[PDB]
């Protein structure tokens, strides 16, 4: 019951996906598949709203972070009431 945020191995290591998140879904974890020695991860997709700001800042040829809209809750529908 949350939007599905997936990280692929084409991630360069730029933290812009994490800095562009308004609900603290993504974080940076260590890795070894790129020069930056880090990759993004989505452990808190239960708070994901689906704004897709994270994949609006991904600089690869296609998005290494992908948000698939899914079952919606009160915190996934952006409801303050």
């Amino acid at each position: 019951m949350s939007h599905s945020v997936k990280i692929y191995d084409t991630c360069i290591g730029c933290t812009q996906c994490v800095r562009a998140c308004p609900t603290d879904v993504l974080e940076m974890i260590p890795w070894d598949g790129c020069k930056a020695k880090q990759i993004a991860s989505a452990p808190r997709t239960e708070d994901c709203v689906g704004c897709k700001r994270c994949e609006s800042a991904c600089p690869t040829d296609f998005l290494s972070v992908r948000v698939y809209l899914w079952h919606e809750t009160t915190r996934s529908m952006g409801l303050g009431y």
Binding site: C51, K52, R53, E55, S56, A57, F62, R66, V67, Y68, L69
Partner: protein, 73 residues
């Protein structure tokens, strides 16, 4: 009759263009290579990559319904 039949042909060709474009770009395009993972009907892919409103094949059907109505009219 000639003019209205050519307008009819225009309507048929345009509606076919919309529907065929939706059917053939349903699985993906250069803007959204993984459209098949998002199902038939989804709203958009966000404002990134310039904007992605009406990018699904369902939206192609929705746009082509107007042209079909105009042609039958």
């Amino acid at each position: 009759d000639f003019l209205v039949h050519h307008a009819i042909a225009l309507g048929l060709h345009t509606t076919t263009l919309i529907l065929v474009k939706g059917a053939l770009d349903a699985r993906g395009s250069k803007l959204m290579p993984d459209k098949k993972d998002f199902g038939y009907s989804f709203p958009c892919d966000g404002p990134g990559r310039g904007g992605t409103c009406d990018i699904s094949a369902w939206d192609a059907f929705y746009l082509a319904v107007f042209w079909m109505l105009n042609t039958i009219g």
